[PDB]
Design a protein around this motif. Structure first.
Motif, short mmCIF file in Angstrom:
data_model
loop_
_atom_site.label_atom_id
_atom_site.label_comp_id
_atom_site.label_asym_id
_atom_site.label_seq_id
_atom_site.Cartn_x
_atom_site.Cartn_y
_atom_site.Cartn_z
N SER A 1 -9.35 24.97 -0.84
CA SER A 1 -8.80 24.50 0.42
C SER A 1 -7.78 25.48 0.96
N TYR A 2 -7.67 25.53 2.29
CA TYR A 2 -6.75 26.40 2.99
C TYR A 2 -5.96 25.57 3.99
N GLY A 3 -4.63 25.66 3.94
CA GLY A 3 -3.79 24.80 4.74
C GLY A 3 -2.68 25.58 5.44
N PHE A 4 -2.02 24.88 6.36
CA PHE A 4 -0.94 25.44 7.15
C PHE A 4 0.02 24.29 7.45
N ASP A 5 1.31 24.51 7.23
CA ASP A 5 2.28 23.42 7.31
C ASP A 5 3.29 23.59 8.44
N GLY A 6 3.06 24.52 9.36
CA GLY A 6 3.98 24.80 10.44
C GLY A 6 4.82 26.04 10.21
N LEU A 7 5.15 26.33 8.96
CA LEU A 7 5.90 27.53 8.61
C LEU A 7 5.26 28.35 7.50
N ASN B 1 9.05 30.45 17.48
CA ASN B 1 9.77 29.23 17.12
C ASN B 1 9.20 28.64 15.82
N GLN B 2 9.27 29.44 14.77
CA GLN B 2 8.74 29.02 13.47
C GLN B 2 9.59 27.90 12.90
N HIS B 3 8.93 26.82 12.48
CA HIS B 3 9.60 25.63 11.97
C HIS B 3 8.57 24.69 11.38
N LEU B 4 9.04 23.77 10.54
CA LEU B 4 8.18 22.72 10.02
C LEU B 4 7.69 21.84 11.16
N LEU B 5 6.46 21.35 11.02
CA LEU B 5 5.83 20.56 12.08
C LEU B 5 6.66 19.33 12.43
N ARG B 6 7.22 19.33 13.64
CA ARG B 6 7.95 18.19 14.16
C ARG B 6 7.07 17.45 15.17
N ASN C 1 1.21 24.94 19.04
CA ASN C 1 1.57 24.74 20.45
C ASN C 1 1.03 25.87 21.33
N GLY C 2 -0.16 26.36 21.01
CA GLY C 2 -0.79 27.39 21.81
C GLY C 2 -0.60 28.79 21.28
N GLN C 3 0.59 29.11 20.81
CA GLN C 3 0.87 30.45 20.29
C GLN C 3 0.18 30.63 18.95
N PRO C 4 -0.71 31.61 18.80
CA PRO C 4 -1.42 31.78 17.53
C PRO C 4 -0.48 32.17 16.39
N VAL C 5 -0.85 31.73 15.19
CA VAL C 5 -0.09 32.12 14.00
C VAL C 5 -0.33 33.60 13.72
N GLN C 6 0.68 34.24 13.15
CA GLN C 6 0.64 35.69 12.91
C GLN C 6 0.06 35.99 11.53
N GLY C 7 -1.20 35.60 11.35
CA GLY C 7 -1.89 35.81 10.10
C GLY C 7 -2.90 34.73 9.78
N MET C 8 -4.10 35.13 9.38
CA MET C 8 -5.19 34.22 9.08
C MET C 8 -5.66 34.40 7.64
N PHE C 9 -6.67 33.62 7.26
CA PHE C 9 -7.37 33.78 6.00
C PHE C 9 -8.71 34.48 6.25
N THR D 1 -4.73 37.60 5.35
CA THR D 1 -4.20 38.75 6.07
C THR D 1 -3.10 38.22 6.99
N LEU D 2 -1.86 38.39 6.55
CA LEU D 2 -0.69 38.06 7.35
C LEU D 2 -0.29 39.27 8.18
N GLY D 3 -0.14 39.06 9.49
CA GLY D 3 0.19 40.09 10.43
C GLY D 3 1.62 40.01 10.92
N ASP D 4 1.85 40.60 12.09
CA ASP D 4 3.18 40.76 12.66
C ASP D 4 3.34 39.86 13.88
N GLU D 5 4.59 39.77 14.36
CA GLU D 5 4.87 39.12 15.63
C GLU D 5 4.17 39.82 16.79
N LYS D 6 3.77 41.08 16.61
CA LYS D 6 3.01 41.82 17.60
C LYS D 6 1.50 41.72 17.37
#
Lengths: 189, 885, 126, 69
Positions: B49-55, B70-75, B96-104, B617-622
């Motif tokens: 399994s692959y998960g994402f928790d907001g941060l 605005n990295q933070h735990l899912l509110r 919230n629309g902005q893609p995460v900076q790194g995928m699997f 593969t975790l990437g950058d803010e860019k």
């Protein structure tokens, strides 16, 4: 009896109870008479009666020539095995009617039945056992147990209550009549 | 996508465990991969399994700290749009629309993937789908399908628990078992083409069409109208293709194929007696198979070009299209005919074993099949079939036979819903079964299935269920629940198994996950000889019945939490061990290397390509790629490929594979008989690697572990044991031992499950999953094996129970007599919520309960209690108004 | 996989000559029924004149004007000539080669979707 | 201390009720394990004098209702 045995348990009909009682009386006569058992055995041996055929209810069942025990059918060649005490129709009918007979009496009445059967085992005559039941009738109701609670609950939930628990004489007679039969069944089993 | 409506940050002591992602089913089976049943494990706790928790991104119980605007735990009010792609190896998320900076990436493509959310407790979540199943707040990325578009045909989409069958139901739990994976005929050809085209042109004429190579609807010209003799060459080829397919399938259907008026705008078609001739149902089924083949080749051609229903196989194809294709293809057949040419075992807890008395319980059979019910002693093993050994007394109603060390016929067969009750009188040593309230007749004249058996340990209710089987257990906590008790149990004086029992019986069942257990001496095909000037561990198996064995050492070596001559030997962090394969063992079935604690994969064959690997593969803010961390539960190399050319027949001493682990850099290297192998691995920080070898038994002596050391590399024991860390001499403490992976374990179902208030409806705005019931449990962790087991499960584990009881005694002794500094030190290990839960919990081993109570009274409530009790004898009364009063 | 590459359909004033070349490359089986499909911006898609092997051109309501469509099966190459241009003719034209012969299918569904939809080009009229 | 008060009171009441009904599954597997640690905790709290007047009243009522009525 197998036809209406479920019904007869759901509601202990007066005819149900009475039939169980006199079947028990016939069995008591058969057990007490040694000539009864010997003559029944001779009759069954002479006529080669298949008692288990009557014991097993005739239902829809076929083998389609699968698992034919012809070797076993050749193996049984014993005249003594033709007639067996387990295969006897009298005791088979008692087994079929036994839950109804137990429903006749209350669980505390069943406790007294067990005690009276113990008295029969301890070389006691019928009237002596009846007097013992009369003396010990106090145990009914006094003997309480969590399982006995639901036993009494289900016994009351059962609709027919033709038995009279308020009559000590009737209760003692029912206890005696079940107990001697169970003692003879213990002898035969 | 899915919005959380309100997430409690600190409903319990810990933060809310909220993770969303995708889980892959293991082995392409309905059993999914992820958190184990009945545990505090969510998604992203394994390679499945692959998960994402907001941060953080979660996979294999390790987080990655993904960065995002605005990295933070899912509110509350978070869109959390997850885009899954499987043709490519990538799973992306956008908070919230902005893609995460790194995928699997490079995750194992095999298996069926589904969305999954672990929502802890005290949370409210609501999904989103397309159509009436939800409102898509954000637009899907290009070339992506809707969430509900993948609904199975003829099925209503619904949400349920991923793997556990928990429903918070008392005495009505559907303990479902294993599931399923879920030249002489050329004239015939020409005449069949003729008949097919005339049948089609009848319908063409009924509209009013004429013939002509041009095909315009306005002109009503149909080139196929002209007969096959004068049919235009392109239309002739078109018709002949389907005619050839039809006759080819006719002759391939297993039956040999040989030789044996109406208003007409154009010409007059003259069909044979298609309807007049009678065709047998077997012929109908064969023509149906032909139609299925035709639709299958149709679908094969179509899938190259749009997620249409026809893309589904014929088995799940819509019945309307299926029947239309069947009749259309069967018309030609009628023309031909006219011319004349892992079973799961559940049981009650062993503590509730009864050595005497009269007992009864009911077993339901919702679906008739491989059902066995009865009583077994605590020594029964999950792997063995119920009743197939002397430790179990079972009965199978479907086959109508008893099982105890053998199979013998008993009674009649049952149907769906036929409850079977189990009379057991231990004092009389009698035990038999009542099917639907009536006593079975056994074979000839008996009624009891088993008799004359030693009591030994108390017998326990047990039931084994096979594939696609559903049954329920009724121990008899409430008599009203029991249905046929008044028919048999009431009359003969048999009491219910759990009528006096105050709380529900904990259920112990055969667990699917196989864990590594220490090798026992009495185990067949398992003999480990410990010799000893370097210590060796050789496995000289004798039975060799099992094919492949996985062997692992008892304790691991951990890598550095932050990755970076006897003197340099002492400064170095590299540790070396080796594996020597005895002659007669084929190297190609031997894999030597390291594993983590997450390796629970079992199969009759092992391949390095089947190793569960996913690299995030975790990437950058860019958006620039910087880090590509690869995870795996298995790092070995194949001894057969490591074998140097000719060493399989020329090496009299066998093959030696030496493994070197550099913990400062997290590097695994391998050497084959002094030759360095090109295969090397890089592991993550804080990773615990277990020495392990997988081998197929082909000779009595397979292989051996050597704890020796090579030049400038410390021995394995130096990294294993902290006490021996600077000494380079190889030693073999008794703690170190080999463990083989086995399936002989039991698992306990919790008495209280996490109740979920899921909507269970196709409501708008998506299905709602809400759970506001805080449920917690204490998990005891074994530092050596890097595993966790519920503290309640120690009841059946006698060794861990005793060791933990003595550990609590040691805590009490070390903090006894008012040692306040030690009490403060122990306050960290033994926490206040832990003590409160331990004292409050009804389900608890007696020894642990007493130990926790004593520990509480010692760390707290001890100094004041003792001082006050000691002072009690003295009496000093102040001279005050209350004293005068 | 049969891929159709369509080139042409430039932009000029009305009345000019427009040349369109569509080439189909792929499997050697099931080459028949090349057609053009016209779609205006945010409007219904219509069927342009469809030519098949044997010089069989199937016309429709959109063939009004000066059309000259000719196909060669040696290389699966179609030349389309537009002489009269109208402002309403501005649309995207897609070149398709479906094995459905000439636009009829006695079989039905197992071939109505048997279409190889190739690339197209935008024709613009001033 | 207050949470401990409420906890020990509720479990002591439930334990005395369970012992009265004589269940076959005492907490911990034995009535000794059910009672001894709980009564030890209650005794230590009573020695420390944490319990207030109402708590002592409830304790006396549960241990012996007739005498301490």
């Amino acid at each position: 009896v197998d036809y209406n045995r479920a019904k007869w348990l759901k509601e202990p009909n007066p005819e149900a109870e009475e039939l169980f009682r006199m079947v028990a009386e016939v069995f008591i006569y058969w057990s007490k008479s040694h000539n009864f058992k010997r003559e029944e055995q001779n009759f069954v041996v002479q006529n080669e009666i298949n008692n288990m055929s009557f014991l097993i209810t005739d239902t829809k069942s076929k083998m389609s020539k699968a698992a034919i025990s012809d070797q076993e059918r050749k193996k049984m060649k014993r005249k003594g095995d033709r007639y067996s005490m387990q295969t006897s129709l009298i005791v088979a009918a008692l087994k079929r009617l036994l839950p109804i007979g137990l429903n006749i009496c209350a669980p505390g009445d069943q406790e007294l039945i067990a005690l009276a059967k113990n008295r029969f085992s301890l070389k006691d005559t019928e009237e002596e056992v009846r007097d013992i039941i009369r003396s010990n009738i106090h145990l009914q109701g006094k003997l309480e147990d969590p399982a006995i609670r639901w036993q009494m609950a289900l016994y009351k939930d059962l609709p027919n209550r033709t038995e009279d628990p308020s009559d000590p004489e009737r209760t003692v007679e029912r206890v005696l009549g079940i107990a001697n039969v169970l003692f003879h069944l213990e002898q035969k089993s | 996508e899915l919005m959380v409506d309100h997430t409690e940050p600190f409903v319990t002591a810990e933060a809310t465990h909220l993770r969303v992602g995708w889980a892959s089913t293991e082995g392409y089976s309905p059993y999914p991969g992820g958190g184990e049943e009945w545990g505090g494990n969510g998604v992203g706790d394994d390679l499945f399994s692959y998960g994402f928790d907001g941060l953080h991104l979660w996979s294999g119980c390790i987080a990655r700290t993904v960065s995002s605007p605005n990295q933070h735990l899912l509110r509350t009010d978070d869109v959390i749009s997850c885009c899954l792609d499987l043709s490519a190896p990538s799973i992306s998320f956008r908070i919230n629309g902005q893609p995460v900076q790194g995928m699997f990436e490079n995750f194992n493509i095999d298996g069926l993937f589904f969305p999954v959310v672990s929502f802890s407790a005290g949370i409210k979540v609501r999904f989103l789908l397309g159509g009436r199943h939800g409102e898509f707040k954000f637009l899907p990325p290009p070339g992506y399908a809707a969430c509900y578009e993948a609904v199975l045909p003829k099925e209503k989409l619904k949400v349920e628990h991923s793997r556990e069958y928990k429903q918070e139901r008392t005495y009505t739990r559907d303990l479902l078992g294993p599931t399923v994976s879920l030249p002489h005929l050329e004239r015939i050809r020409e005449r069949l083409a003729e008949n097919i085209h005339e049948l089609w042109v009848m319908n063409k004429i009924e509209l009013g069409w004429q013939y002509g190579p041009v095909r315009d609807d306005n002109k009503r010209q149909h080139p196929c109208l002209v007969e096959f003799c004068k049919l235009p060459e392109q239309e002739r080829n078109y018709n002949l293709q389907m005619s050839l397919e039809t006759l080819k399938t006719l002759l391939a259907l297993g039956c040999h194929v040989g030789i044996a008026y109406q208003l007409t705008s154009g010409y007059k078609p003259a069909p044979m007696d298609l309807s007049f001739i009678k065709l047998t149902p077997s012929q109908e089924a064969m023509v149906d198979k032909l139609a299925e083949n035709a639709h299958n080749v149709w679908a094969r051609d179509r899938i190259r070009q749009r997620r249409n229903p026809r893309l589904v196989p014929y088995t799940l194809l819509d019945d309307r299209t299926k029947k239309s294709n069947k009749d259309s293809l069967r018309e030609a057949v009628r023309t031909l005919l006219g011319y004349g040419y892992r079973f799961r075992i559940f049981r009650a807890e062993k503590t509730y074993a009864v050595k005497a008395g009269r007992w009864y319980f009911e077993f339901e059979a919702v679906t008739a099949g491989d059902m066995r019910v009865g009583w077994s002693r605590p020594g029964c093993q999950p792997d063995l079939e119920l009743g197939s050994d002397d430790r179990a007394f079972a009965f199978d109603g479907f086959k109508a036979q008893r099982w105890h060390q053998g199979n013998e016929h008993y009674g009649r067969s049952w149907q769906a819903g036929d409850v079977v009750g189990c009379m057991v009188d231990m004092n009389e040593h009698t035990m038999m079964f009542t099917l639907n309230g009536e006593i079975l007749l056994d074979d000839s004249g008996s009624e009891l299935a088993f008799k004359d058996f030693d009591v030994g340990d108390g017998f326990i209710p047990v039931c084994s269920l096979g594939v696609a089987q559903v049954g329920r257990m009724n121990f008899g906590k409430d008599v009203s629940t029991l249905k046929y008790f008044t028919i048999c149990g009431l009359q003969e004086g048999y009491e219910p198994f759990a009528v006096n029992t105050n709380r529900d019986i904990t259920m112990w069942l055969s667990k699917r996950l196989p864990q590594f257990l220490q090798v026992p001496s009495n185990h067949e095909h398992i003999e480990v000889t410990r010799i000893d000037k370097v210590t060796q561990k050789s496995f000289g198996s004798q039975n060799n019945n099992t094919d492949i064995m996985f062997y692992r050492l008892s304790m691991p070596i951990e890598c550095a939490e932050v990755f970076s001559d006897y003197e340099y030997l002492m400064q170095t962090s590299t540790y070396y061990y080796s594996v020597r394969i005895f002659p007669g063992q084929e190297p190609a079935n031997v894999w030597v290397g390291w594993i983590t604690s997450d390796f629970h994969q079992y199969d009759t064959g092992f391949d390095l390509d089947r190793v569960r690997t996913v690299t995030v593969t975790l990437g950058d803010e860019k958006g620039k790629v910087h880090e590509s961390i690869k995870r795996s539960n298995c790092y070995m190399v194949c001894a057969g490929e490591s074998m140097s050319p000719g060493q399989g027949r020329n090496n009299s001493n066998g093959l030696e594979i030496g493994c070197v682990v550099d913990a400062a850099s997290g590097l695994l290297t391998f050497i084959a008989n002094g030759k360095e192998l090109s295969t090397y691995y890089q592991v993550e920080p804080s990773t615990k690697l277990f020495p392990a070898v997988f081998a197929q038994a082909t000779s009595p002596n397979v292989f051996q572990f050597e704890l020796g050391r090579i030049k400038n590399v410390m021995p394995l024991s130096a990294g294993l044991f902290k006490s021996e860390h600077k000494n380079p001499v190889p030693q073999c403490p008794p703690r170190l031992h080999v463990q083989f992976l086995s399936h002989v374990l039991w698992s306990r179902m919790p008495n209280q499950f996490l109740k979920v208030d899921v909507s269970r409806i196709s409501e708008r705005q998506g299905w709602l999953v809400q759970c506001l019931d805080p449920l917690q449990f204490m998990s005891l962790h074994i530092p050596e094996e890097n595993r966790s087991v519920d503290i309640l499960e120690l009841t059946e584990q006698e060794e861990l129970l005793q060791f933990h009881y003595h550990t609590l005694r040691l805590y009490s002794a070390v903090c006894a007599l008012g040692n306040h500094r030690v009490a403060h030190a122990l306050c960290s290990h033994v926490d206040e919520p832990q003590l409160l839960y331990a004292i409050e919990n009804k389900y608890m081993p007696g020894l642990l309960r007493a130990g926790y109570y004593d520990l509480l009274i010692d760390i707290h409530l001890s100094s004041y209690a003792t001082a006050r009790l000691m002072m009690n004898n003295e009496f000093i009364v102040p001279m005050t108004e209350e004293t005068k009063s | 996989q049969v891929q159709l590459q369509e080139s042409g359909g430039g932009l000029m004033q009305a009345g000019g000559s427009l040349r369109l070349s569509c080439t189909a490359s792929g499997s050697i089986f099931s080459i028949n029924s090349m057609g053009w499909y016209r779609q205006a911006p945010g409007k219904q898609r219509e069927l342009v004149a469809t030519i098949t092997s044997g010089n069989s051109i199937n016309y429709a309501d959109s063939v009004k004007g000066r059309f000259t469509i000719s196909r060669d099966n040696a290389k699966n190459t179609v030349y389309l000539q537009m002489n009269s241009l109208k402002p309403e003719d501005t649309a995207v034209y897609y070149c398709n080669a479906d094995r459905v012969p000439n636009g009829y299918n006695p079989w039905g569904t197992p071939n109505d979707e048997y279409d190889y939809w190739g690339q197209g080009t935008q024709v613009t009229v001033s | 201390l207050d949470i401990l008060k409420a906890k020990t009171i509720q479990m002591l009441t439930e334990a005395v009720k369970e012992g009265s009904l004589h269940a076959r599954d005492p907490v911990g597997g034995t009535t000794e394990f059910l009672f001894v640690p709980l009564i030890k905790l209650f005794y230590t709290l009573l020695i420390m004098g944490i319990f207030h007047n109402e708590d002592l009243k409830h304790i006396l009522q549960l241990i012996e209702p007739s005498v301490f009525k």
